[PDB]
Design a protein around this ligand. Structure first.
Ligand SMILES: *[C@@H]1O[C@H](CO)[C@@H](O[C@@H]2O[C@H](CO)[C@@H](O[C@@H]3O[C@H](CO[C@H]4O[C@H](CO)[C@@H](O)[C@H](O)[C@@H]4O)[C@@H](O)[C@H](O[C@H]4O[C@H](CO)[C@@H](O)[C@H](O)[C@@H]4O)[C@@H]3O)[C@H](O)[C@H]2NC(C)=O)[C@H](O)[C@H]1NC(C)=O
Ligand SMILES: *[C@@H]1O[C@H](CO)[C@@H](O[C@@H]2O[C@H](CO)[C@@H](O)[C@H](O)[C@H]2NC(C)=O)[C@H](O)[C@H]1NC(C)=O
Ligand SMILES: O=c1ccn([C@@H]2O[C@H](COP(=O)(O)OP(=O)(O)O)[C@@H](O)[C@H]2O)c(=O)[nH]1
Ligand SMILES: O=c1ccn([C@@H]2O[C@H](COP(=O)(O)OP(=O)(O)O)[C@@H](O)[C@H]2O)c(=O)[nH]1
Ligand SMILES: CC(=O)N[C@@H]1[C@@H](O)[C@H](O)[C@@H](CO)O[C@H]1O
Ligand SMILES: *[C@@H]1O[C@H](CO)[C@@H](O)[C@H](O)[C@H]1NC(C)=O
Ligand SMILES: *[C@H]1O[C@H](CO)[C@H](O)[C@H](O)[C@H]1NC(C)=O
Ligand SMILES: *[C@H]1O[C@H](CO)[C@H](O)[C@H](O)[C@H]1NC(C)=O
Ligand SMILES: *[C@H]1O[C@H](CO)[C@H](O)[C@H](O)[C@H]1NC(C)=O
Ligand SMILES: [Mn+2]
Ligand SMILES: [Mn+2]
Lengths: 16, 500, 7, 449, 15
């Protein structure tokens, strides 16, 4: 497919 | 005030919206807006403070810019060439080579030649009379070019302030370094200029899709926190990069046995790393690109064509055992004829390239493909005889449980050495007692993505919740549950290795 | 996504 | 007893009868032959429950006689069965095989030996013009000892009188141009066997042989991308040796074959290119230098991939361990033309045994290719320059045991040590007490890819 | 061509 854009994603959590 | 000056979005008044959409189909970006924007429009300087103070050595190698296009719009192509001319020190540009890949547009023929001959940098127009891929067009354009460094750019790009000196300086520091700018986003709706982050680099997933991914901590520690130093990127996007011409020849250029369906970006990334070179995102170099949601052109020969040829060629030449992670999720790819890879195997032999495991361990330890794992296959319940199935669902959605079809694909999981339950770039995640088992971006930080598979008890225990994976309930029958561990046969799971 | 076919 | 055990000239037409198949008018299909195994193989009793063999056999051949050669001389309990387009009168339905006590027809499209060879017996390939006591048990016993063991002693059956003559167990190789050739079994093979000739010989190359079917499949059979022009023997020998198996001339097994001088039915070096590019490594050049590097040899991807799957060793391991007496030297100091400094001409063999080497204008275009080897020989193909008298330069079969020894990179003189004389200008070079002249100086440069 | 026959040059072992 087309090259993906570097879109901002959801924040990942660092601890549970 | 001028449309788009300084990266400003161009909003089309509603009176014209309809016509805009029609004009949008030609290039799969807002052409009506692009034609209001000046071919020499100003853009912001987006470099990190600290790249602006850098002084780069003199006698930097001149570059030939190769721009290949198929049915590019007049405004985008010309804006690209003007962006390289106006924002490049004149003595650092040998030429611009525009490779016309059998374009069917009036303005891309004689008008293009007339316009380009009036530029103060020599701009040549080379013509592929037969529709040829990007690989073939780039090989033509590079064979024609004279500059010691070859810079490849798409025909819908805009260089920014200070984009070229960093790349040429990195190459002069080491001729076996292949360098990519930070690829900024040029909106396909408004052509607004948006800077890309220096904390994002290139990798791939089990599907062999190129993917953007966060720069990991090891790469900040290597640079001791200095974001202005280049990043070692596992893969390149492919649209934009620079390479010494002689080194481009020495590493085997592109795989000429590949078809038109792409994949060369991953192939050349693997080849550059495994065969002794370095691939880098030069964080002081920015160049914008009109990312699109689909291509505006068809490929010759209709639809339903055999695809994944090039993925098979690259996987069979470079990926070693790990090719399986691709094949197992792509039912049927193992019967597609991938042509003759003899020259490529021999090239790997000549250069004594390292194994793909060395690449996973040293270049891409944060890879989506696990370098070590305990199991690869279906996750079957002992009681209900069903299998976990990702159901093609995206991040934050629930993993399902359905009848095992044994065809691989979306019922393939891996219990990895990091003790994740992973399916491509998603991991099983529980963030609530008795909560749903969701699929989130794997973060390599264990925690709620940590599971324990007891090989004798066959239990899948979510560690942080301390609950075991169990069969679906009557209220949510197509989804596994997590419940206090009971010792039941519904809480036992078979995590066996599927082979060929 | 891969080939579904089945229920 | 026609031919039982020689056929005399039928003088006062044979010319016609012989060239059609390239005599044999009274020879019985149930002919008597001598028992040719060495005494000491007859004392050997070979194990029981030996794997049964399927014998694979035909192209415009009387010889039938070959089928009886297996039938009459095979323990019935060791043969499971006997298995190309033949467009002739007798080469049709003419019934006979249905009357044999052993189960014995495929054919359509004219196909090569590979395609024709590509059965129910657990193990044997044989030509359609072959014919000896106790021949099978040795082969099958060595196979049972190791299923990864791959040849009988091939006796000569005269193509002129059909007289049977046994071949030596002390002959087992190939030369530049990748031709298979017979060569003496070297000393190392006798020292390994401590003098016992009845133990099989480990042969660097093959030309008929037997192999377990499952191991035959494990190694990828023959290269199916090859044409009909031969070469598969070196390919399969190299594959068997490099990829972990064993190939042997089993000296207690004798089987006769009518070696011929020519066949009744362009550059056809495709299969040679495939073989060299898959198995020969750096060494492929020794072929290329004497023959054109543009013959299209098709796709070898599957073959490199098989070499990857079976974890085969390099051709250097083969040259050093299996064929150290190879015609191709594993190491050499020079490969190219031998040019005189004074006359600017080059040595040229003009293509055999005992002949004088010539010297003609260097053309740089085969017959002017020589190699100064690590063994300090001056060799061209399967010949080495040899001088046997103070003051002619002849070409003798290389023997790998030092008057073929020559010695100077700074003086560029080629000193024959045993003669103490240098090679010099004359249609033949001379040998003369070394004088230091430019007529005795020679350029031994490396031809480059 | 046809396979070479196993028939013997007389070879010498020492000069
Ligand atoms: C499902 O399929 C997968 C993939 O095939 C299987 O995983 C493989 O399992 C084998 C067997 O355990 C693994 O091979 C073992 O690797 C261990 C760790 O490797 C070390 O060394 C390498 C060197 O490159 C390092 O890269 C790595 O980081 C480790 O440091 C070794 O400990 C093993 O060696 C053991 O045996 C030898 C003798 O045989 C001893 O000398 C050693 O000291 C040691 O005791 C062995 O080499 C292989 O790595 C696994 N592949 C992976 C993880 O990707 C699964 O087992 C299979 N599942 C089931 C249920 O069968
Ligand atoms: C891009 O190029 C055009 C053409 O050279 C520039 O247009 C100039 O604009 C200024 C400001 O109105 C005028 O004074 C000049 O006379 C114009 N030149 C011409 C040839 O018309 C434009 O300014 C440039 N864009 C920039 C520098 O951002
Ligand atoms: O058959 C083709 C298809 C595309 N391209 C060019 O190759 C570049 C990359 O293609 P595209 O921009 O459509 O892909 P994307 O950047 O969205 O991944 C573009 O400059 C295209 O014009 C080409 O030369 N021949
Ligand atoms: O098109 C062909 C060419 C050759 N052969 C077989 O190849 C074998 C070897 O040929 P030949 O006997 O002439 O070689 P030689 O033993 O004389 O060296 C023979 O059994 C032929 O039957 C075949 O079946 N089809
Ligand atoms: C096959 C061969 O000849 N290899 C040699 C190698 O052994 C030697 O070390 C090198 C230096 O001259 O030259 C080459
Ligand atoms: C010729 O080439 C061989 C192969 O590398 C090499 O070993 C030898 O030294 C060369 N001879 C020269 C340079 O005289
Ligand atoms: C942090 O919280 C999210 C849910 O909001 C995920 O469970 C994620 O896995 C957590 N991160 C760690 C390391 O446990
Ligand atoms: C096909 O897609 C569906 C999702 O709707 C399921 O994941 C199914 O398991 C898939 N079948 C495969 C990949 O074989
Ligand atoms: C052995 O004799 C022949 C000549 O009759 C060869 O020339 C050979 O070189 C001689 N010398 C040996 C074998 O060392
Ligand atoms: Mn693009
Ligand atoms: Mn024959």
């Amino acid at each position: 497919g087309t090259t993906p854009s570097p879109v901002p994603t959801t924040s990942t959590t660092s601890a549970p | 005030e001028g449309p788009g000056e300084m990266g400003k979005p161009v909003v089309i008044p509603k009176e014209d919206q309809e016509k805009m959409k029609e004009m949008f189909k030609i290039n799969q970006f807002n052409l009506m807006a692009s034609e209001m924007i000046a071919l020499n429009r100003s853009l912001p300087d987006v470099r990190l403070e600290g790249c602006k103070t850098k002084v780069y050595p003199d006698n930097l190698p001149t570059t030939s810019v190769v721009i290949v296009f198929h049915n590019e719009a007049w405004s985008t192509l010309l804006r690209t060439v003007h962006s390289v001319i106006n924002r490049s020190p004149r003595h650092m540009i040998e030429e611009i080579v525009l490779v016309d890949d059998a374009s069917e547009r009036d303005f891309l023929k004689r008008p293009l030649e007339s316009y380009v001959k009036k530029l103060k940098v020599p701009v040549h127009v080379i013509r592929m009379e037969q529709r040829s891929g990007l690989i073939r067009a780039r090989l033509k354009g590079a064979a024609v070019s004279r500059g010691q460094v070859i810079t490849f750019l798409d025909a819908h790009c805009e260089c920014t302030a200070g984009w070229l000196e960093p790349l040429l300086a990195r190459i002069k520091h080491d001729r076996r370094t292949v360098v990519c700018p930070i690829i900024d986003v040029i909106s396909d709706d408004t052509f607004e200029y948006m800077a890309g982050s220096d904390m994002t680099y290139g990798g791939f997933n089990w599907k062999l899709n190129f993917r953007w991914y966060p720069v990991p901590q090891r790469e900040m520690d290597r640079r001791k926190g200095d974001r202005t130093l280049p990043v070692r990127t596992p893969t390149m996007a492919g649209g934009l990069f620079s390479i010494d011409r002689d080194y481009f020849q020495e590493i085997g250029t592109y795989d000429a046995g590949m078809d038109i369906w792409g994949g060369e970006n991953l192939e050349i990334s693997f080849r550059i790393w495994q065969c002794g070179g370095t691939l880098e995102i030069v964080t002081c170099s920015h160049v914008g690109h009109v990312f699109r949601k689909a291509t505006p052109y068809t490929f010759p020969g209709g639809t339903g064509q055999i695809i994944n040829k090039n993925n098979r060629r690259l996987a069979e030449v470079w990926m070693d055992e790990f090719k399986n992670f691709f094949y197992i999720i792509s039912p049927g790819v193992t019967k597609v004829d991938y042509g003759d890879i003899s020259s490529r195997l021999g090239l790997r032999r000549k250069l004594q390239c390292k194994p793909f495991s060395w690449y996973l361990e040293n270049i891409y330890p944060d890879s989506q493909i696990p370098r070590h794992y305990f199991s690869l296959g279906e996750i079957r319940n002992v009681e209900t005889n069903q299998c976990l199935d990702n159901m093609a669902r995206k991040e934050n959605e629930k993993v399902g449980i359905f009848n095992c079809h044994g065809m691989g694909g979306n019922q393939v999981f891996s219990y990895t050495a990091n003790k994740e339950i992973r399916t491509d770039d998603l991991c099983l995640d529980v963030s609530k007692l008795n909560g749903p088992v969701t699929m989130l971006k794997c973060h390599h930080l264990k925690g709620n993505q940590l599971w324990e598979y007891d090989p004798v008890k066959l239990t899948l225990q979510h560690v942080n919740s301390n609950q075991c994976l169990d069969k679906a309930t009557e209220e949510d029958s197509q989804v596994p549950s997590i419940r206090d561990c009971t010792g039941s046969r519904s809480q036992q799971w078979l995590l066996r290795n599927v082979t060929l």
